[PDB]
Amino acid sequence: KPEPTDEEWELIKTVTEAHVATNAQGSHWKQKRKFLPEDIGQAPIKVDLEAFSHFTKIITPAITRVVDFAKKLPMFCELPCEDQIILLKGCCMEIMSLRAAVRYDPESETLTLNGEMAVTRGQLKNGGLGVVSDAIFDLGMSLSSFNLDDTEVALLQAVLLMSSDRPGLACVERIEKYQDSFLLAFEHYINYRKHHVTHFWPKLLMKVTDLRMIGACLASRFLHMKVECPTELFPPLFLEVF
Amino acid sequence: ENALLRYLLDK
Ligand SMILES: Cc1nc(C(=O)NCC(=O)O)c(O)c2ccc(Oc3ccccc3)cc12
């Protein structure tokens, strides 16, 4: 099967370095991690607002890491400022969810947010995510046997970031051109890696769909989070990506 | 709108 060209290797290196340099705690994350205690994030009587507070505090640096990842990609910097904002609003939650999902620990059954906070399925559920919490944990469980490396995670992030179907974009064709560069490099790098999983590329393309769904559902659930909570309670950067 | 995100993109 075809493997990366020299231009594709260059591209591989760029996004991998962008990902590694924006990924919280990087190599240290499993040592710097503290478990959110069980008494926070239990099921009420709606939202457990003490758990909500802990996630409310860490969402801003999570978004910001994503902004810093996109800025390290020369193709993203080519785009007009308006398309950049559109692309960031659309892929932020998709990329954060992915970054949490690859940090699943089956021994504890936790995801690690922000490189620091390990939370359980029930805590992330009751802290405001609802059924989207089950979707992220299921994604993380099925990603163990895929054994993704930093390059593969980096390229998934790129594929999500260069989504030309976001509403309001002007460089629809330009952005889709970029996405096909990542996808072909990604396929060729996957051909070169020889995973012991059958139909790996098809199965990976299905996980991209999974993340797009999580993304679209977080946006749904945040409007249904303006019920018990007033907008003041959400940090400003979070509101910007409705 | 998007003043915060926009300043993070310009920084
Ligand atoms: C989906 C994801 N991820 C991360 C994250 O930092 N981890 C991934 C990473 O290493 O970057 C978060 O910190 C999140 C925080 C809140 C959140 O929703 C909520 C927002 C407000 C209230 C409750 C949940 C989703 C997150």
Overall description:
Chain A: It is found in: Nucleus. The complex is a heterodimer of chains A (242) and B (11). Chain A has 242 residues and is mainly alpha-helical. Chain A is built from 10 helices and 3 strands, in the order αβαααββαααααα. In chain A, helix 4 packs antiparallel against helix 7 (150-161), helix 4 (81-101) crosses helix 9 (200-223) and helix 5 (121-129) runs antiparallel to helix 6 (131-142). Chain A is globular. With 11 residues, chain B is mostly helical. Chain B has one helix at 3-10. The chains are: A mainly alpha (242), B mainly alpha (11). At the A-B interface, helix 2, helix 4 and helix 10 of A face helix 1 of B.
Spell out the key features of this protein.
heterodimer; A: about 240 residues; mainly alpha; Retinoid X Receptor; 3-stranded mixed sheet; about 5% strand; globular; B: about 10 residues; 1 helix; about 75% helix; about 0% strand; binds the ligand Cc1nc(C(=O)NCC(=O)O)c(O)c2ccc(Oc3ccccc3)cc12; transcription; agonist; thyroid hormone receptor; anemia; dimeric
Largest sheet of chain A: 3 strands, mixed
* Greatest interface (CB-CB under 8 A), with counts per chain: A-B, 12 and 8 residues
- Looking at the structure, the CATH topology of chain A is Retinoid X Receptor
Order of helices and strands of chain A: HEHHHEEHHHHHH
Number of domains of chain A: 1
Instruction: State the distance separating the first and last CA atoms of chain B.
Output: 17 Å
- Write down the overall geometry of chain B: elongated
Please write the CATH class name of chain A. Answer: Mainly Alpha
Percent in strands of chain A: under 5%
Tally of helical runs of chain B: 1
For the biggest sheet of chain B, the summary is: none
What value does the Rg of chain A take, in angstroms? Answer: 18 Å
Query: Which CATH architecture of chain A would you pick?
Result: Orthogonal Bundle
Question: Which hetero compounds are present in the coordinates?
Answer: the ligand Cc1nc(C(=O)NCC(=O)O)c(O)c2ccc(Oc3ccccc3)cc12
Structural class of chain B: mainly alpha
Identify the overall geometry of chain A. Answer: globular
Number of strands of chain A: 3
Order of helices and strands of chain B: H
Taken as a percent bin, the fraction of beta residues of chain B is: under 5%
Category by helix and strand content of chain A:
mainly alpha
**Rg over C-alpha atoms of chain B, rounded to the nearest angstrom:** 5 Å
